[PDB]
Design a protein around this ligand. Structure first.
Ligand SMILES: CC(C)NC[C@@H](O)COc1ccc(CC(N)=O)cc1
Length: 121
């Protein structure tokens, strides 16, 4: 669920899920349309695509359990939806951590009209 994801982001990046990643680019937080603005925006695009592969699960509200083995994120055995959601977030977190160095504030609160373009998962 989102309680898990946000906690994961903070631990990983140090920035806070909301508002650092709840309204960035064209995909973080708001999904929909567009061409991802930057690397962090691409993690969101890929992440949204990740939840999209799980039709009958509830990413936002189904809680899962994960642990750290010296820094590694280890998703714990749960329902199979819980296992797959967890993997989807673990990636976003890793991806987020990987492009902290290019996280740019001008994409914060990014306006919608500026997000039109085509991208299939
Ligand atoms: C505590 C506050 C009010 N949070 C409400 C909460 O709905 C914030 O919302 C969201 C909505 C959707 C997502 C999708 C995720 N990033 O992939 C992440 C966070």
């Amino acid at each position: 669920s989102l309680l898990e994801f946000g906690k994961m982001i903070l631990e990983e990046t140090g920035k806070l899920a909301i508002p650092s990643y709840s309204s960035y680019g064209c995909y973080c937080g708001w999904g929909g349309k567009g061409t991802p603005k930057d690397a962090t925006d691409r993690c969101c695009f890929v992440h949204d695509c990740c939840y999209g592969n799980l039709p009958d699960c509830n990413p936002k509200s189904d809680r899962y359990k994960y642990k750290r083995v010296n820094g590694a994120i280890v998703c714990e055995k749960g329902t199979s939806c819980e296992n797959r959601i967890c993997e989807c977030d673990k990636a976003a977190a890793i991806c987020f951590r990987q492009n902290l160095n290019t996280y740019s504030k001008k994409y914060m609160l990014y306006p919608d009209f500026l997000c039109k373009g085509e991208l299939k998962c």
